[PDB]
Amino acid sequence: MTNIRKSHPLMKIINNAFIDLPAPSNISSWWNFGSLLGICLILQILTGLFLAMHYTSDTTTAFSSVTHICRDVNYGWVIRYLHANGASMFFICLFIHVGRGLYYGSYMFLETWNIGVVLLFTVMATAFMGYVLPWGQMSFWGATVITNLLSAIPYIGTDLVEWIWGGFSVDKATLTRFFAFHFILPFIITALAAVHLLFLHETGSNNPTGISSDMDKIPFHPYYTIKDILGALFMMLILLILVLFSPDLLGDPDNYTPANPLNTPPHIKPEWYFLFAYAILRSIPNKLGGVLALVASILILILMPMLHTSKQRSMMFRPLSQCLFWMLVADLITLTWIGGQPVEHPFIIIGQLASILYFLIILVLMPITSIIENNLLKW
Amino acid sequence: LSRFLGPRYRELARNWIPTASMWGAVGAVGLVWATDWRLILDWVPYINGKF
Amino acid sequence: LSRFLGPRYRELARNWIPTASMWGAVGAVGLVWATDWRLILDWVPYINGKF
Amino acid sequence: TFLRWASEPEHDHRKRMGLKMLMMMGLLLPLVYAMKRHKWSVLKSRKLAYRPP
Amino acid sequence: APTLTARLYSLLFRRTSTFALTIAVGALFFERAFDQGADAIYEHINQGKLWKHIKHKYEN
Amino acid sequence: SKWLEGIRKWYYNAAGFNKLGLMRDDTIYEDDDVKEAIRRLPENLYNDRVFRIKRALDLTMRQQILPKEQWTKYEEDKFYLEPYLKEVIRERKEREEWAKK
Amino acid sequence: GREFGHLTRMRHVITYSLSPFEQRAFPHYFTKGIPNVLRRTRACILRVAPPFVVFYLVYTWGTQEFEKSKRKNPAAYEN
Amino acid sequence: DNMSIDDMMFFLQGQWMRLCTSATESEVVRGKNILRNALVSHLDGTTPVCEDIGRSLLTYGRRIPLAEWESRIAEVDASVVREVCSKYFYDQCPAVAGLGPIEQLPDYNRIRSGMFWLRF
Ligand code: HEM
Numbered sequence: 001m002t003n004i005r006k007s008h009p010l011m012k013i014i015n016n017a018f019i020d021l022p023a024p025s026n027i028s029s030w031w032n033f034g035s036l037l038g039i040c041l042i043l044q045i046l047t048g049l050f051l052a053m054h055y056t057s058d059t060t061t062a063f064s065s066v067t068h069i070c071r072d073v074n075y076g077w078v079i080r081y082l083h084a085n086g087a088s089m090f091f092i093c094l095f096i097h098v099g100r101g102l103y104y105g106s107y108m109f110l111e112t113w114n115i116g117v118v119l120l121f122t123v124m125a126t127a128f129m130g131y132v133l134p135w136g137q138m139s140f141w142g143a144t145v146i147t148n149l150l151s152a153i154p155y156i157g158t159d160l161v162e163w164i165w166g167g168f169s170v171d172k173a174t175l176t177r178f179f180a181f182h183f184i185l186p187f188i189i190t191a192l193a194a195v196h197l198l199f200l201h202e203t204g205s206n207n208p209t210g211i212s213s214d215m216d217k218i219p220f221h222p223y224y225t226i227k228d229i230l231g232a233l234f235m236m237l238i239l240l241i242l243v244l245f246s247p248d249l250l251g252d253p254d255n256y257t258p259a260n261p262l263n264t265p266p267h268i269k270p271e272w273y274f275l276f277a278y279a280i281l282r283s284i285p286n287k288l289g290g291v292l293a294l295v296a297s298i299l300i301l302i303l304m305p306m307l308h309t310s311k312q313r314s315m316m317f318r319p320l321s322q323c324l325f326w327m328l329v330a331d332l333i334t335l336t337w338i339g340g341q342p343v344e345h346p347f348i349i350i351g352q353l354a355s356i357l358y359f360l361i362i363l364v365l366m367p368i369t370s371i372i373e374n375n376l377l378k379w
Numbered sequence: 380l381s382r383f384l385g386p387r388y389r390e391l392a393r394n395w396i397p398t399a400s401m402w403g404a405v406g407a408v409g410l411v412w413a414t415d416w417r418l419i420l421d422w423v424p425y426i427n428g429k430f
Numbered sequence: 431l432s433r434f435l436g437p438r439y440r441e442l443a444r445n446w447i448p449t450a451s452m453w454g455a456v457g458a459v460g461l462v463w464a465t466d467w468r469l470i471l472d473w474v475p476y477i478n479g480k481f
Numbered sequence: 482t483f484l485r486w487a488s489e490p491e492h493d494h495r496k497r498m499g500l501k502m503l504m505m506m507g508l509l510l511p512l513v514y515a516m517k518r519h520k521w522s523v524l525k526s527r528k529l530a531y532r533p534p
Numbered sequence: 535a536p537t538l539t540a541r542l543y544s545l546l547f548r549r550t551s552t553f554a555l556t557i558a559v560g561a562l563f564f565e566r567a568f569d570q571g572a573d574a575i576y577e578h579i580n581q582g583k584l585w586k587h588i589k590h591k592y593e594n
Numbered sequence: 595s596k597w598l599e600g601i602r603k604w605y606y607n608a609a610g611f612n613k614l615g616l617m618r619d620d621t622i623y624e625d626d627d628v629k630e631a632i633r634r635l636p637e638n639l640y641n642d643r644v645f646r647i648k649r650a651l652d653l654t655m656r657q658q659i660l661p662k663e664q665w666t667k668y669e670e671d672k673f674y675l676e677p678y679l680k681e682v683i684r685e686r687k688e689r690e691e692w693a694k695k
Numbered sequence: 696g697r698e699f700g701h702l703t704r705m706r707h708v709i710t711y712s713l714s715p716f717e718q719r720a721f722p723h724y725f726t727k728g729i730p731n732v733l734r735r736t737r738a739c740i741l742r743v744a745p746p747f748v749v750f751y752l753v754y755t756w757g758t759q760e761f762e763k764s765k766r767k768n769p770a771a772y773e774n
Numbered sequence: 775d776n777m778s779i780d781d782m783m784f785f786l787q788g789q790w791m792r793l794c795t796s797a798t799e800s801e802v803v804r805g806k807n808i809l810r811n812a813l814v815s816h817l818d819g820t821t822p823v824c825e826d827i828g829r830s831l832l833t834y835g836r837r838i839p840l841a842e843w844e845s846r847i848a849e850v851d852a853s854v855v856r857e858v859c860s861k862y863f864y865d866q867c868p869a870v871a872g873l874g875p876i877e878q879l880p881d882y883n884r885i886r887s888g889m890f891w892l893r894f
């Protein structure tokens with residue numbers, strides 16, 4: 001005989017992936033965010049499927065549709081705010097996982113890291129398209145601002161922007177296209193996540209120490225399944241705190257006014273997850289330079305494996321790199337704060353210096369510091 | 380199917396019938412609780428207090 | 431870049447430059463063909479009839 | 482107050498669900514943590530001894 | 535002498551069918567009890583505001 | 595030399611591989627050259643490295659550090675892998691030079 | 696490929712484990728836990744904190760400077 | 775072998791749980807006959823008989839006659855086997871010792887989980 005778990009094909013795949021997968025025994029709670037990310041993706045898919053049963057993509061009926069969900073669909077407010085704040089939880093976990101990979105040298109898993117970069121881009125696109133769907137003033141004007149950035153691309157910017165718009169400006173066509181894309185993209189994200197896990201399982205999972213843990217591998221089923229359930233429960237606590245006590249904490253009030261294309265909102269600012277890229281974009285005076293810098297901010301992650309110069313994979317045993325990494329985190333927080341703030345004398349200079357510091361820390365300071373640490377260790 | 384009509388299989392059925400009955404009881408209680416089946420629940424004391 | 435700086439690699443580049451140039455031309459023609467780039471296509475005699 | 486009700490007709494129900502969720506989380510998180518500790522105690526108490534020949 | 539927890543284990547927890555029976559019956563009764571208790575807690579916290587409290591003054 | 599040694603010792607203590615009982619070569623990233631160097635290690639050294647790494651991983655699992663008396667000293671840290679890694683890198687460099695021309 | 700049987704070669708490492716039901720889930724959770732948390736925080740704080748202190752200073756300065764910028768200048772209306 | 779420890783553990787624990795939950799009369803008869811023959815064969819020759827006498831006097835305080843052994847074995851039924859195997863084998867924490875290439879040997883939590891059946 002044979003155990004069905006180990007011999008049946010689908011059960012074989014499932015067992016290898018999450019029941020008998022050799023997992024490092026010293027993985028910390030920063031290794032719970034990724035499974036939290038998958039839970040967030042599933043939760044977003046379900047909540048959105050239930051929302052879309054009541055949402056209409058025509059400009060005449062979109063805002064009324066969202067109001068219908070909030071005030072008339074049974075438990076509709078729960079689903080709507082679960083989706084809205086789940087997007088924020090999604091991006092929080094995404095940033096935390098990017099930080100974990102940066103700090104512990106998980107980017108050395110080149111294929112997994114690059115697939116993750118692709119996933120990050122796809123999720124950002126999904127969030128931006130979703131924000132336009134409610135069709136509030138913020139949705140319309142933020143879409144107008146962000147899409148207009150593509151016009152900067154030389155000799156094809158205008159045609160590409162008009163093709164995306166479906167017309168001369170953001171309008172019913174753009175809303176319908178964004179509803180379709182917002183629906184389809186998450187499943188592409190799920191497939192990319194499957195590829196991500198495949199590539200990760202090829203090489204295993206890096207531990208906090210940065211040293212190979214083949215000696216101390218523990219089964220995932222009797223240990224990390226319960227650890228991830230606990231982490232998911234904590235994340236659910238936070239998300240439900242948002243949904244049931246501060247449903248509008250992370251959202252701008254202006255999106256509760258129907259979009260008026262003839263009057264701009266007093267402040268046109270993107271969602272909080274996009275704010276650092278917005279600050280970087282505003283930092284560069286030239287439009288094309290701003291667009292290229294915004295692209296490079298996310299794409300600099302691709303260059304992270306090459307920039308590695310330390311003889312040690314993880315930053316746990318490298319203090320100066322730890323100081324630089326925490327400087328980078330503070331800089332990202334500063335960029336978000338600046339992107340939220342109006343463009344004025346105090347904020348403009350701070351944003352420019354912060355963008356310079358972000359790129360400098362990633363490209364120059366970190367590798368030179370790693371080399372200095374290598375010399376100090378006599379390596 | 381003729382393979383399973385023997386004394387030993389009858390013994391196995393006898394051994395597992397109580398556990399199968401317990402699983403059926405679990406399923407019935409779960410169905411009543413999940414669907415809030417008032418036909419059964421209304422007879423249940425201190426739960427009839429609802430509705 | 432340190433490894434790929436030697437006499438053999440320079441020879442290897444020379445061998446493959448004719449192929450790379452030909453593939454680049456294939457991309458150039460395909461882009462112009464697919465996009466119907468009137469700027470480039472106007473020069474071509476027979477395709478010029480399109481416009 | 483009326484305008485606040487209009488904007489958020491689910492205000493009181495949201496508050497009730499929040500109270501219930503806070504109590505349920507207060508119950509579950511300690512118990513799930515206890516389950517995780519129960520499973521991980523075997524590793525946490527593990528004593529490893531290198532005994533070369 | 536068996537303790538209360540030992541009696542619980544032997545009677546219900548040992549065989550997973552009785553374990554699930556315990557789980558389900560407790561689920562039904564805990565739904566009832568917790569909903570009742572937390573509703574009472576919230577109604578006390580907001581006594582005199584909730585419509586249910588003030589419905590009598592305007593009905594009939 | 596004394597000033598450089600003092601700063602190096604400060605970095606050694608600031609990094610925590612000593613606290614977990616690990617030696618410096620225990621913390622090297624396992625690239626292909628390092629993998630071959632480990633493959634070439636004598637059995638005693640390989641086993642000692644394996645146990646040190648396992649103990650460090652267990653300590654990190656419980657978020658604990660080894661008792662201060664048992665911390666590896668800067669003087670007594672022995673670079674066991676460095677000669678094998680140097681030999682491996684030399685062989686790789688020779689092969690690359692042959693490939694170049 | 697990566698399966699428990701053939702992951703790595705290890706020799707002469709003896710591990711002693713205890714059943715979960717024979718050991719307490721929370722042993723010395725506070726008597727030992729709080730000192731260990733304090734030790735980890737002592738180790739981390741010097742590296743982690745300073746950048747966020749810099750952020751707080753920058754944030755306060757920027758907010759105060761913007762508030763000052765909005766404020767009226769008496770000299771403008773002196774004439 | 776190094777790669778067969780997990781399967782062997784699965785099958786051994788499965789047999790334990792199968793005896794605990796769904797034991798059958800025919801295998802009980804086979805086991806009773808095996809025990810009877812083992813008892814009779816072992817007590818053959820002066821060395822085994824003398825060893826049995828001394829050890830029985832030390833342990834049982836008396837040498838249980840083969841007739842008493844046979845009676846006690848006859849009393850055994852599928853119900854008795856199920857009851858005793860449930861008492862000693864089911865949901866009871868095991869003690870495991872491993873030597874050699876034992877990496878595939880299941881972790882203690884998994885071995886303990888094998889000691890009970892979710893179905894039962
Ligand atoms: C929808 C978005 C994402 C999901 C659902 C997701 C999911 C996961 C999961 C479940 C894991 C394994 C669990 C863990 O290591 O904690 C993982 C690992 C990983 N992810 Fe993600 N991820 C997402 C986005 C990203 C992004 C944006 C990056 C980098 C910019 C990234 C890079 C990584 C890396 C490097 C690992 C390996 C960590 C390690 O080996 O310790 N992922 N991901």
Ligand code: HEM
Nearest residue numbers: 044045048049051052055066080084087127130131134186
């Ligand atoms: C990671 C996956 C997803 C993310 C991060 C995301 C993000 C968002 C965000 C931030 C909003 C704005 C909420 C608001 O302004 O109140 C939104 C709205 C919406 N999304 Fe998604 N979404 C995701 C997946 C989906 C899916 C799978 C569907 C449908 C199957 C969907 C359908 C909708 C609908 C109907 C709305 C309108 C809700 C409203 O107007 O309040 N989304 N989404």
